[PDB]
Amino acid sequence: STAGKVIKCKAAVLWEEKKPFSIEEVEVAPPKAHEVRIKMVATGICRSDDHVVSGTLVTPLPVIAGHEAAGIVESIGEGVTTVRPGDKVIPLFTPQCGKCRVCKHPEGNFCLKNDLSMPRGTMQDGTSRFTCRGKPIHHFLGTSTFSQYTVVDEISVAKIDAASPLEKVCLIGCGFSTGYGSAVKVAKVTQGSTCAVFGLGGVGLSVIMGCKAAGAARIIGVDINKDKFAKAKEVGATECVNPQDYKKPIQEVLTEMSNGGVDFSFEVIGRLDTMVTALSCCQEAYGVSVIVGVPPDSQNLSMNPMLLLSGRTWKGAIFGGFKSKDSVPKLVADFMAKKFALDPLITHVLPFEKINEGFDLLRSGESIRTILTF
Amino acid sequence: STAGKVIKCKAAVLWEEKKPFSIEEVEVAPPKAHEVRIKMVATGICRSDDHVVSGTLVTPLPVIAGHEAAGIVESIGEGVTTVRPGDKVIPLFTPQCGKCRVCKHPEGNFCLKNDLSMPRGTMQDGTSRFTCRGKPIHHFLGTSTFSQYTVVDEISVAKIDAASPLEKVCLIGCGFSTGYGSAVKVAKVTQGSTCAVFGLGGVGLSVIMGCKAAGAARIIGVDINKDKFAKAKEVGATECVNPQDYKKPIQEVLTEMSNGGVDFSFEVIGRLDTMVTALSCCQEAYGVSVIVGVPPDSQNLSMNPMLLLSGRTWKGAIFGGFKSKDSVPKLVADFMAKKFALDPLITHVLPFEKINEGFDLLRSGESIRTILTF
Ligand SMILES: NC(=O)c1ccc[n+]([C@@H]2O[C@H](COP(=O)([O-])OP(=O)(O)OC[C@H]3O[C@@H](n4cnc5c(N)ncnc54)[C@H](O)[C@@H]3O)[C@@H](O)[C@H]2O)c1
Ligand SMILES: NC(=O)c1ccc[n+]([C@@H]2O[C@H](COP(=O)([O-])OP(=O)(O)OC[C@H]3O[C@@H](n4cnc5c(N)ncnc54)[C@H](O)[C@@H]3O)[C@@H](O)[C@H]2O)c1
Ligand SMILES: [Zn+2]
Ligand SMILES: [Zn+2]
Ligand SMILES: [Zn+2]
Ligand SMILES: [Zn+2]
Fold this sequence. Notes:
The structure is a homodimer.
Chain A: E1 7-14, E2 22-28, E3 35-44, H1 47-54, E4 63-64, E5 68-76, E6 88-91, E7 130-132, E8 135-137, E9 149-153, E10 157-159, H2 166-169, H3 175-186, E11 194-198, H4 202-213, E12 218-222, H5 229-232, E13 239-241, H6 250-257, E14 264-267, H7 272-280, E15 288-291, H8 306-309, E16 313-316, H9 324-336, E17 346-351, H10 355-363, E18 369-373
One zinc ion binds at residues 96-97, 100, 102-103, 111-112 of chain A.
């Protein structure tokens, strides 16, 4: 195994929408200017990949999805100084350039050179690295980790502790940092406060873990699928409310149940109705609603601005407000100190060739996170 | 003059919408328990009164509007311990009871016993005091000051110092505290930041005064009426942009002028497309847009939630985040130290009987504030 050879490995190429991930053979180019090629170890299955295959994230197809992962650097670029081959890394959902306008600001992680505002499906030089049956396959958000080998940039890769169990640590890359960081850093949950969480996936259970870590008194988990409440109460949900039980709207349910509205509210579903709902179930004068789940594309809201004008605050968060190269090594380093229990997010551990199976476990609602070990 | 007699005095009663303020003879009942009856001195003309006569604030009419005022306590009710007859006070657009859930929160001024979320047009005993030709006339948000005498509550009145020129100090009651407080307290404008202000009335010029007072580098004033730019540059507007000059949409005008969007943005107009515009002209990762102007009633927005989801923050503010009985005496006390120059808001000083004239100066765009001295 040399450093500048093209690797024929296996990947899960998605060709067009509403079709299964075709696990096929791809050629992977060596690292060009300021790149890192990663032997991939464990890759989580996020709902954003289901947003790719369902069509609510418009990315240029054919694509290799996957952004929630950890791996080992196997070949290195020409001038990169952060990582060297052999050490465990996490591919970063949002890069940290260090030179841009956002990266020099005290708050703000959404770098200007990411791939989510205007998705090009490629790397920052303009050219892809995956070729499958002679045609190029697009990347996904600069990580594209549904393969045995991926190629990322230096600014979108994070060096983590060398003794990290990657099958669990791969959740720091997208899901847990989004939820936990959305609770403790974006919303800034104060002690004794009352929180509401809309959606109990890996992100929502991470929100409950963050609100419990910030010392919230009541944490209210709101979800249709009632089985997930049995998970939510073990990570901090003191109350659990199903919208399908109540013919009254759930705005007024969380209003009367939490004495006029919750203090902090979170929407991790990704639907517009629960965005407006999660805003309107806050307190009218000091409520903070954080949008976490991504909406379907080219679709707007219908929102009464008086809901904001009485005193609410309505934020958003990508990767939980965490500057990635700065916060991922200290979140894995804080996982070393057992600060958070990352085990209740993982429900299924499957090999890579069963990848569609994992997505069925994501689409039938029978799983929280399905880890793809390689 | 005694303390418990019904007083015939002149007022500007608005009977039904889209009609002039009929200045007629009203009777004012004496103040009941925990109420204050005020010799009114000077009453400013706000755009929210034009929102009453235009129909975008659904209140129960016939109503005596007007909330920007300063007066003298002339008779007192029982149980009132704060103010005593003879001292200058300011009626409060939003009360501060001190016992509610909002009034014990560190941030949040929107008290639960106000009259703006569910407007009843009366006081907390459910009973008005203005009778005109035998029929009762409704209050306006518990501070109905288009009359020579008025009756407010103890929770909705603020004792100011005895040496205050009320013809200028009456703008602390609604307008200036909304603008200045929206800049320095709700948005928390940091040192050297870049601000944008949509609308250059009394509230918008107060926003510019607050952003300059918090040390903003660039303050961009955006308004259709170009004459108002000649006022805005004397209170801090380093740049001034007209949307009517630019055939390109003003969102990417403010994005191109401020290199990716302004740091803080403010919408003090009170209309929906400028709210979505003022949100979208912030920075994608650390922008804060504050809604100030009240929208038309029961009309929603059409807003792309990705604008919030990249990292923006979208707030609102009634009375600029100021707890009223706590902040009005220290804002008049800070007017004593000449901390802010309140003269450039006042453009016209008219008597009360010319009140419709002042509203014409509000509706033709030829004035900033029209003070109604008695
Ligand atoms: N902002 C970010 O950076 C970021 C990062 C990761 C994921 N996400 C987004 O988070 C979203 C969900 O991710 P996930 O990990 O939580 O998986 P998930 O979709 O399985 O969890 C969402 C839950 O919402 C519930 N749901 C659907 N409709 C509902 C309704 N009316 N009321 C209540 N609940 C309802 C579902 O039961 C589901 O359990 C996705 O859209 C993903 O894109 C955002
Ligand atoms: N939140 C609060 O507590 C509070 C308090 C006082 C006033 N207000 C609201 O503030 C709003 C107006 O306040 P004001 O005192 O400045 O009155 P104003 O009418 O003098 O200011 C409005 C300005 O908006 C501008 N305008 C209209 N359309 C525009 C457009 N497309 N683009 C740019 N500018 C446009 C007008 O030129 C005007 O200068 C009102 O809705 C009023 O109710 C809110
Ligand atoms: Zn993910
Ligand atoms: Zn950056
Ligand atoms: Zn006003
Ligand atoms: Zn109160």
